[PDB]
């Protein structure tokens with residue numbers, strides 16, 4: 732698709748068999764999901780945003796579908812205000828910004 | 831242009847006579863610039879994201895040139911570590927996210 736930006740660019744994602752809403756965020760280096768169960772071991776990571784830094788759980792090689800496009804990569808889990816799809820997975824679904 | 835997302839999507843902007851580097855950010859509702867003076871009236875606002883909230887000054891009807899494209903709208907000013915062009919101005923330059 733071609734998504735305009737008059738409203739938030741919200742899409743459906745599928746992760747761990749569950750459907751969730753997430754924001755396509757070109758200003759986010761990384762993908763961050765609200766609290767949920769994911770398989771495997773996690774690693775620590777600190778990420779920075781508008782309010783400061785915060786700690787998250789880093790899970791690697793997680794299968795995730797984004798607006799129907801399949802991705803497999805790193806998902807951060809933590810107390811984010813909205814689910815965020817960042818550049819690490821936007822590149823995998825072939826997303827570009829155009830003007 | 832078409833901008834890929836392997837790297838942060840940074841462009842040059844001109845605001846208040848000043849050249850700055852800014853991130854094209856589909857996850858940001860409004861444009862947020864590092865501390866600088868701007869003309870006219872302002873009112874305070876709180877914006878939220880990763881790490882919590884930041885207090886900003888909201889200036890309306892400000893012109894920015896974004897990669898050569900003029901746009902007018904609200905600009906938030908505060909202690910952001912990165913200048914952010916949000917949806918309110920991305921729409922005006924006809925930016926879309928494509929995949």
Ligand SMILES: CC(C)CN(C[C@@H](O)[C@H](Cc1ccccc1)NC(=O)O[C@H]1CCOC1)S(=O)(=O)c1ccc(N)cc1
Pocket residue numbers: 754756757758759760761762763778779780781782813815817855857858859860861862877878879880911912914916
């Ligand atoms: C969290 C989203 C919903 C909203 N933010 C935009 C995001 O693109 C934000 C932009 C940013 C980059 C670097 C440092 C500081 C901020 N990146 C972000 O947090 O990257 C983290 C998440 C994972 O990867 C790393 S915002 O900055 O809070 C914000 C909120 C309101 C307005 N009006 C403007 C900006």
Ligand SMILES: [Cl-]
Pocket residue numbers: 803804805819820
């Ligand atoms: Cl990844």
Ligand SMILES: [Cl-]
Pocket residue numbers: 902903904918919
């Ligand atoms: Cl505006």
Ligand SMILES: [Cl-]
Pocket residue numbers: 735924
């Ligand atoms: Cl349009």
Ligand code: NA
Pocket residue numbers: 869870871889890891892
């Ligand atoms: Na004004």
